[PDB]
Tab-separated table of C-alpha atoms in Angstrom:
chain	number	residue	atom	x	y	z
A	164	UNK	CA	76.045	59.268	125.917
A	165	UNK	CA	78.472	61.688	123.980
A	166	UNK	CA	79.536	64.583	126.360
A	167	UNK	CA	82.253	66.710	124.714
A	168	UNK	CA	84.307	69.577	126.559
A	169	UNK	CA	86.334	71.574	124.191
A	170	UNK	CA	88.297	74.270	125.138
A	171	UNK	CA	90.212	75.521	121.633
A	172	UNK	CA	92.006	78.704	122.457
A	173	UNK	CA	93.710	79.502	118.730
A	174	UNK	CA	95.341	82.775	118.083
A	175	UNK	CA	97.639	84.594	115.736
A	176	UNK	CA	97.562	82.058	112.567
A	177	UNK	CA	96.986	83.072	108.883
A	178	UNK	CA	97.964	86.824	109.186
A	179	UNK	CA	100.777	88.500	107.092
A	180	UNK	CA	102.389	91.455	108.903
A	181	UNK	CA	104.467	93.287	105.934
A	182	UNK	CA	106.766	96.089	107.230
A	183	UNK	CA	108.894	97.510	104.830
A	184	UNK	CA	109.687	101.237	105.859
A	185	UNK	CA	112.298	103.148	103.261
A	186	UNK	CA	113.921	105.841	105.188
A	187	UNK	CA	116.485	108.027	103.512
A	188	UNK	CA	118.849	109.963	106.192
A	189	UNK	CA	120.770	112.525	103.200
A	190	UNK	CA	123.071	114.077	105.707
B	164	UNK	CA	79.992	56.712	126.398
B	165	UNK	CA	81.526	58.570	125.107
B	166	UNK	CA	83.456	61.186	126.531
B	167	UNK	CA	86.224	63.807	125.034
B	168	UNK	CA	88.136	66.678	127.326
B	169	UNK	CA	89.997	68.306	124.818
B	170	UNK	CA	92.175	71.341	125.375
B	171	UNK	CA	93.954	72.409	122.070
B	172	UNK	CA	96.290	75.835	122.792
B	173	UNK	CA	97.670	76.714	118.942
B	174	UNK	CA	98.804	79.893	118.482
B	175	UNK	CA	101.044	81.252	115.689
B	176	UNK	CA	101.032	79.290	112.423
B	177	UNK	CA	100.455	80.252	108.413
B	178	UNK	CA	101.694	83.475	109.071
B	179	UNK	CA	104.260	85.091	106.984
B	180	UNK	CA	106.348	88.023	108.589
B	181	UNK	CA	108.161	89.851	105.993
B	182	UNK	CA	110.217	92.936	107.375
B	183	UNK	CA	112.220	94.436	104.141
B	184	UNK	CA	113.246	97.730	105.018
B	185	UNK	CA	115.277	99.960	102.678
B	186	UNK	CA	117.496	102.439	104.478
B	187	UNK	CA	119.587	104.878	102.088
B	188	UNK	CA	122.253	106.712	105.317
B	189	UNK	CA	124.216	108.916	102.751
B	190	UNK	CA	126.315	110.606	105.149
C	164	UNK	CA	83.568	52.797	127.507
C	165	UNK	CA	85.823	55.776	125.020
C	166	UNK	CA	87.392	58.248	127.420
C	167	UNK	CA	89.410	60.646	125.157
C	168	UNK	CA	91.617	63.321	127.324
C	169	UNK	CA	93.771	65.357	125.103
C	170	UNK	CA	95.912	68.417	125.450
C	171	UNK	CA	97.251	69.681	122.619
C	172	UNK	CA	99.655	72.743	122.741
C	173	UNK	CA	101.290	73.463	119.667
C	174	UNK	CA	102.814	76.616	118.062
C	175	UNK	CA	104.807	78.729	115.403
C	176	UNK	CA	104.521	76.385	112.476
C	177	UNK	CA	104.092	76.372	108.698
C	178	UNK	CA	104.890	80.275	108.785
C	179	UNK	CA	107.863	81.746	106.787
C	180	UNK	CA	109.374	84.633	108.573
C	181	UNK	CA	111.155	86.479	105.792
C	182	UNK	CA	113.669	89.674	107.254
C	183	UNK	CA	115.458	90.842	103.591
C	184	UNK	CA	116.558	95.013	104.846
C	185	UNK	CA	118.817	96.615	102.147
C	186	UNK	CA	121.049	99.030	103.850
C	187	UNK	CA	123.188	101.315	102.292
C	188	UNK	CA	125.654	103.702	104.634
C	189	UNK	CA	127.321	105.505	102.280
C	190	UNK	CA	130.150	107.516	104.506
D	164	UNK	CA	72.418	62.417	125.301
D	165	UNK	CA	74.693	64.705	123.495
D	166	UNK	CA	75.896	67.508	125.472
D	167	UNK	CA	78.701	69.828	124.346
D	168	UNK	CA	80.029	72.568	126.460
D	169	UNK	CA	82.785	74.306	123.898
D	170	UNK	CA	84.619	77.714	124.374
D	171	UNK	CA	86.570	78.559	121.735
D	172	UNK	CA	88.261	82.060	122.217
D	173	UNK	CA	90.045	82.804	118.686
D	174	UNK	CA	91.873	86.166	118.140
D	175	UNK	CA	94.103	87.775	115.801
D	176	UNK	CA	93.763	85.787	112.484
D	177	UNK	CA	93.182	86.401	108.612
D	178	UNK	CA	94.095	89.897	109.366
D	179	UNK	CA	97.348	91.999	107.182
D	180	UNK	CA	98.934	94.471	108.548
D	181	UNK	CA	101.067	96.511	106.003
D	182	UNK	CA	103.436	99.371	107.531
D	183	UNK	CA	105.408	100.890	104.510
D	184	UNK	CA	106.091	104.691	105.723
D	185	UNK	CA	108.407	106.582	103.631
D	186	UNK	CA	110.745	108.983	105.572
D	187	UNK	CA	113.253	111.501	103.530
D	188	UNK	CA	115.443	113.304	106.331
D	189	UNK	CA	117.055	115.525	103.939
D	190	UNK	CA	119.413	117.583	106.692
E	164	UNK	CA	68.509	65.368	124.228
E	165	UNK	CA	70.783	68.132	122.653
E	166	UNK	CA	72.093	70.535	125.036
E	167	UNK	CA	74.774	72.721	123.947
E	168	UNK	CA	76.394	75.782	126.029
E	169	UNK	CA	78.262	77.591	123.575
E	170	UNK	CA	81.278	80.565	124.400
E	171	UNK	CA	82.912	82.170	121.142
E	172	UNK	CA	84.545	85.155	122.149
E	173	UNK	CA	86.734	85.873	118.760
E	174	UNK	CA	88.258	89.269	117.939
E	175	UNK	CA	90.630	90.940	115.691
E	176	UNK	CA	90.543	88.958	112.218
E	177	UNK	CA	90.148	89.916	108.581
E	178	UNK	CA	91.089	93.326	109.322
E	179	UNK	CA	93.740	95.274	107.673
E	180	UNK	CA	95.700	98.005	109.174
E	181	UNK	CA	97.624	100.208	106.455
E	182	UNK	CA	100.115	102.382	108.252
E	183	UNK	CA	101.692	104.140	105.198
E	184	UNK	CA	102.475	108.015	106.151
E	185	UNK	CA	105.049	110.408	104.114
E	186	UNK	CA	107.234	112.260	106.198
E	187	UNK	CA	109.586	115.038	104.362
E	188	UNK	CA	111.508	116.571	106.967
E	189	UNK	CA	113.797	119.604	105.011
E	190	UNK	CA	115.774	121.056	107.230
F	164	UNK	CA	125.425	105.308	112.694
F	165	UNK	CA	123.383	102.905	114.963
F	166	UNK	CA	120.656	101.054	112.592
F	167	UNK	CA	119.001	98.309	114.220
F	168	UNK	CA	116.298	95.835	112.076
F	169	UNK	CA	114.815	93.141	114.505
F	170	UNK	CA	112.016	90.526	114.388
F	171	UNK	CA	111.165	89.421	117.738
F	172	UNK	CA	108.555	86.115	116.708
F	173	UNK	CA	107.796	84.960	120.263
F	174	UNK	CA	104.507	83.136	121.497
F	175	UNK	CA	103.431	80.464	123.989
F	176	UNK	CA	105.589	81.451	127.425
F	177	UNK	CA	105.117	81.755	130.736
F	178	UNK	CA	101.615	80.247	130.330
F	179	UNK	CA	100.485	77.026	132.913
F	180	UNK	CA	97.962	74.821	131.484
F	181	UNK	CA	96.049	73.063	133.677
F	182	UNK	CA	93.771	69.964	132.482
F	183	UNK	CA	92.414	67.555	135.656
F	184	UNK	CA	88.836	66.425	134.615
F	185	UNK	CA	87.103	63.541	137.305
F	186	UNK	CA	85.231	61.398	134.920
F	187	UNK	CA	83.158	58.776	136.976
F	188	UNK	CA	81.718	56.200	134.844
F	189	UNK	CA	79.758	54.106	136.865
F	190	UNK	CA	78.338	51.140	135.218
G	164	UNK	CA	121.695	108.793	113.565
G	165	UNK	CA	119.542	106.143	115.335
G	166	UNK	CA	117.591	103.831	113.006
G	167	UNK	CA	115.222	101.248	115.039
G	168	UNK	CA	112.744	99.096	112.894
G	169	UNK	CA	110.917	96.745	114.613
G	170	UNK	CA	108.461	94.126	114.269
G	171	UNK	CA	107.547	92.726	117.698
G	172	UNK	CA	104.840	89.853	116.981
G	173	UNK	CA	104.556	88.338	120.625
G	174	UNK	CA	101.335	86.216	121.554
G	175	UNK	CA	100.076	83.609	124.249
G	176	UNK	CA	102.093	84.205	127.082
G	177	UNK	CA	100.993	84.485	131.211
G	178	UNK	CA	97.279	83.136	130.923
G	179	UNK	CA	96.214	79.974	132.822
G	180	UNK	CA	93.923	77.942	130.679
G	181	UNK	CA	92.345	76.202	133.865
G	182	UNK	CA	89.765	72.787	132.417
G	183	UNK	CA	88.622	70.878	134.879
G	184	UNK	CA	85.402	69.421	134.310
G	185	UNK	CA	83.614	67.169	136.353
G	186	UNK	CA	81.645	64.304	134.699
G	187	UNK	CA	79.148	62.358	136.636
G	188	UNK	CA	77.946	59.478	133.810
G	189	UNK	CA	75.812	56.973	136.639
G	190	UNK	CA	74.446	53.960	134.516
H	164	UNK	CA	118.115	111.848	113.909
H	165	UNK	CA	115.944	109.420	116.322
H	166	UNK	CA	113.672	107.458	113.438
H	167	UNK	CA	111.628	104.570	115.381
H	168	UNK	CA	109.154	102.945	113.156
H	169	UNK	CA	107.702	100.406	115.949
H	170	UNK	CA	105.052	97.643	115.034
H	171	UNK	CA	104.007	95.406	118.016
H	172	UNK	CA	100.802	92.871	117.217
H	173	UNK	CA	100.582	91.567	120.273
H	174	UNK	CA	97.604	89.397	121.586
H	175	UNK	CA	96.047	87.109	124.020
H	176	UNK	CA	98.516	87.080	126.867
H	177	UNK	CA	97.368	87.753	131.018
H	178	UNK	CA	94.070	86.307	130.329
H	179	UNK	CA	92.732	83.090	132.201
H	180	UNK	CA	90.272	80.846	130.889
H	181	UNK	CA	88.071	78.615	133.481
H	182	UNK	CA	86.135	75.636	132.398
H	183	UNK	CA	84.750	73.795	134.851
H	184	UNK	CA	81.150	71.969	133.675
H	185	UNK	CA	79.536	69.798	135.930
H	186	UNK	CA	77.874	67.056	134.332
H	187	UNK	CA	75.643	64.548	135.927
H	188	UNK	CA	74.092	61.867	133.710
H	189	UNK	CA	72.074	60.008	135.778
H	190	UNK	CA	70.676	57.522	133.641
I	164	UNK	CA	114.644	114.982	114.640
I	165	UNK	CA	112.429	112.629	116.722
I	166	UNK	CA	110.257	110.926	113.735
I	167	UNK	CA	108.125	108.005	115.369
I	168	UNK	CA	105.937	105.947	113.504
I	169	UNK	CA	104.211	103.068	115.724
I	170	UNK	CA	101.400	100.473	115.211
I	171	UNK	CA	100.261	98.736	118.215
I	172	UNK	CA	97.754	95.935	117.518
I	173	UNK	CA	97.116	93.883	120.615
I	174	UNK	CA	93.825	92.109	121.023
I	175	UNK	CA	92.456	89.830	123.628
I	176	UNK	CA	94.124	90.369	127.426
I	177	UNK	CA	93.882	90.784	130.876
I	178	UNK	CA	90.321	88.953	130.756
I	179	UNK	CA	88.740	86.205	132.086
I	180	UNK	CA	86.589	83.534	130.512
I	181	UNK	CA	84.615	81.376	133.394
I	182	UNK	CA	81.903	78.824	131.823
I	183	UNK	CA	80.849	76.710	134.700
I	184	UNK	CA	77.628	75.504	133.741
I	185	UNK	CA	75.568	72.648	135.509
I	186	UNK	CA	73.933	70.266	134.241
I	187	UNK	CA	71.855	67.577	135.531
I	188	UNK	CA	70.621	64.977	133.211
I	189	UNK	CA	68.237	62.599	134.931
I	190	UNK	CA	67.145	59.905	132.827
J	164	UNK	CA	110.857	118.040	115.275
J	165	UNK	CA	108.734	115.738	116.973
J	166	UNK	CA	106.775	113.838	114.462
J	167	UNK	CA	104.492	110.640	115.948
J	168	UNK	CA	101.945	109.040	114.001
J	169	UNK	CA	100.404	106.432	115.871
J	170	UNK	CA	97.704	103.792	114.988
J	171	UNK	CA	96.873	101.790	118.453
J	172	UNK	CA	93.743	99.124	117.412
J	173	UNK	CA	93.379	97.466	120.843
J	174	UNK	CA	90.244	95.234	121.515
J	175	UNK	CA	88.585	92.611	123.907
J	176	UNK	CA	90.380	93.431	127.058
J	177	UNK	CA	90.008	93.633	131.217
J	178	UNK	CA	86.555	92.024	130.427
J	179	UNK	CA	84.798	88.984	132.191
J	180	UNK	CA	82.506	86.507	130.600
J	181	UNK	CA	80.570	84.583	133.301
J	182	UNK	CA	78.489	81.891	131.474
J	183	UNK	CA	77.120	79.970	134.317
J	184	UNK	CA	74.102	77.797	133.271
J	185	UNK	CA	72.035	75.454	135.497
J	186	UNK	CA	70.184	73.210	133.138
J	187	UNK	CA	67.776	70.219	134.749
J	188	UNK	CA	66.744	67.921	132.391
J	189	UNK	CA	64.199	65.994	134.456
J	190	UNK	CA	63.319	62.971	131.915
């Protein structure tokens, strides 16, 4: 009876990517 | 009976991205 | 008899994408 | 009966990537 | 009965990267 | 001078997916 | 002078997810 | 002068994924 | 001058997943 | 000058995964 073909390609969930440089150019 | 072809493609989701940069040019 | 074929493709949701820079050019 | 051929290929999740340098070009 | 092929190829998750160098350039 | 912040969120492009399963259910 | 921060999160782009299963069920 | 702070999390892109079971339940 | 901070995380390309299995269920 | 710090965390790439089963259940 049941026959199950998954195919679940998931990517780039739940992830916090924080960039916060501070760059101070005193010319 | 039963049969299930499933092909889920999910990709980017509860992710936060938070770029704050702080950049002091004091020519 | 159940024949489920399903292709699901979804992306980029429930994800806050927060871009607050401070930049100060003082000339 | 049951047979279930899955391939799930996940990547990139759960993961934080935090890039805070601190540059002082003091010309 | 129960046959079940199985493919899992997963990668890059609850990782974090800290990127957080000090750069003092005195010219 | 030329200060440039950008976010560049993009996913899911230029991707073809292809789902044609034969199910034969002879009763 | 040039300032360039970045934040390039790109994913799921040019791959062919290809299912095509072939399902026999002969009562 | 040149400051590049670069962060590129890219993933899962130029990759194809074949499924293609062949099931034959001859009951 | 040239100050270059960079963080490449990419994950999960240019490879191929083939599950093609066979199998023959004869009741 | 030249200043590069670099963190490059690549993974799972130009790889093959060839599952290819024959199974014969001969009830």
């Amino acid at each position: 009876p049941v026959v199950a073909i998954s195919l679940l390609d998931t990517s780039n969930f739940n992830n916090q990517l924080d960039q916060t440089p501070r760059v101070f150019y005193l010319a």
